[PDB]
């Protein structure tokens, strides 16, 4: 799936994650900005500090940090195209603030940093190395370092409650199946798991903000946008991919509408 395909429905910043409609009247793009600000506004960034963006994407977050918090910034991505893109954007920076993009994984970064931010990308599920991750977050942040993790989470067996659906172990397991195999179709971390993995590597989860409502609308806006470009979509990929996404976007939006799927920002203050 070409990056061109996703550009058919994502906003100009190409943010493939939950948007934050701080205002109901916000556009997908404004919501993505607010989401980024929501994240950043939680790190207590001070001019001169160095921010690490784990999974910088097309760079919207980095640039926003430099702009509103006047800080140096290091971004990591496993996407040649995203690195290329941000690297070009960063070229000839007169700004008295360092801006660096790296085509490496977080497990290969080893630099003193003041604050860490990690906003995941939708279909990128693989939260099975969270323990080692905090160890690294700890091993890089200042004594009062702070990190924000924006991730999709799933319901912990003993975490559900008060939704109006069966409370059995059989129903939970079925939903767990649906969630891991179809919508979204990957293994998701539970809120307890993150709070626990963090509380065991030198961190303390100060806040857990849910953006569940917002994702329903984000996905709603992505599907509408995609449908409006059905022609181009079928032309870049095929009618099979187009349909797959329309129903995968639709299905995932519903999983949030029942709560077995959630998206949280975890302020991890150490």
Swiss-Prot record:
Enzyme Commission identifier(s): 2.1.1.79
Cell compartment(s), UniProt: Cytoplasm
Keyword presence, Cell inner membrane: no
Residue ranges crossing the lipid bilayer per the database entry: none
Any one Gene Ontology molecular-function term assigned to this protein's record: cyclopropane-fatty-acyl-phospholipid synthase activity
Principal subcellular localisation of the protein: cytoplasm
SUPFAM superfamilies reported in the protein's UniProt record: S-adenosyl-L-methionine-dependent methyltransferases
Pathway linked to the protein: Lipid metabolism; mycolic acid biosynthesis
Reactions listed under catalytic activity: a 1-acyl-2-(9Z)-enoyl-sn-glycero-3-phospholipid + S-adenosyl-L-methionine = a 1-acyl-2-(9-cyclopronane)-acyl-sn-glycero-3-phospholipid + S-adenosyl-L-homocysteine + H(+)
Keyword line: Cytoplasm, Lipid biosynthesis, Lipid metabolism, Methyltransferase, S-adenosyl-L-methionine, Transferase
Keyword Lipid biosynthesis among UniProt keywords: yes
Alphabetized InterPro entries for the sequence: CFA/CMAS, CMAS, CMAS_actinobact, SAM-dependent_MTases_sf
Active-site residues, as the UniProt record annotates them: 252
Domain of life: Bacteria
An annotated GO BP: methylation
GO cellular component: cytoplasm
UniProt: S-adenosyl-L-methionine binding residues: 16-17, 51-59, 77-82, 106-107
Record's subunit section: Homodimer.
Family: Belongs to the CFA/CMAS family.
Function: Catalyzes the conversion of a double bond to a cyclopropane ring at the distal position of an alpha mycolic acid via the transfer of a methylene group from S-adenosyl-L-methionine. Cyclopropanated mycolic acids are key factors participating in cell envelope permeability, host immunomodulation and persistence.
Protein name per the record: Cyclopropane mycolic acid synthase 1
Lineage: Bacteria, Bacillati, Actinomycetota, Actinomycetes, Mycobacteriales
């Amino acid at each position: 799936l070409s990056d061109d395909f996703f550009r058919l429905f994502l906003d100009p910043t190409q943010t493939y994650s939950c948007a934050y409609f701080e205002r109901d009247d916000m556009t997908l793009q404004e919501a993505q900005i607010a989401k980024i600000d929501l994240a950043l506004g939680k790190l207590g960034l001070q001019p001169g500090m160095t921010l690490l963006d784990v999974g910088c994407g097309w760079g919207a977050t980095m640039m926003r940090a430099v702009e509103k918090y006047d800080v140096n910034v290091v971004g990591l991505t496993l996407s040649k195209n995203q690195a290329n893109h941000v690297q070009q954007l960063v070229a000839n920076s007169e700004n008295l603030r360092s801006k660096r993009v790296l085509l490496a994984g977080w497990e290969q970064f080893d630099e003193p940093v003041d604050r860490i931010v990690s906003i995941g990308a939708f279909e990128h599920f693989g939260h099975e190395r969270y323990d080692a991750f905090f160890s690294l977050a700890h091993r890089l942040l200042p004594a009062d370092g702070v990190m924000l993790l924006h991730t999709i989470t799933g319901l912990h067996p003993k975490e559900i409650h008060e939704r109006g659906l069966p409370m059995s172990f059989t129903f939970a397991r079925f939903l767990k199946f649906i969630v891991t195999e179809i919508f979204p179709g990957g293994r998701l971390p539970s809120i307890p798991m993150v709070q626990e993995c963090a509380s065991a590597n030198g961190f303390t989860v100060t806040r857990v903000q849910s953006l569940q409502p917002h994702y329903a609308k984000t996905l709603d806006l992505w599907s509408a946008a995609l449908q409006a470009n059905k022609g181009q979509a079928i032309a870049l990929q095929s009618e099979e991919v187009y349909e797959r996404y329309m129903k995968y976007l639709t299905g995932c939006a519903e999983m949030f509408r029942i709560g077995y799927i959630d998206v949280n920002q975890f302020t991890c203050q150490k």
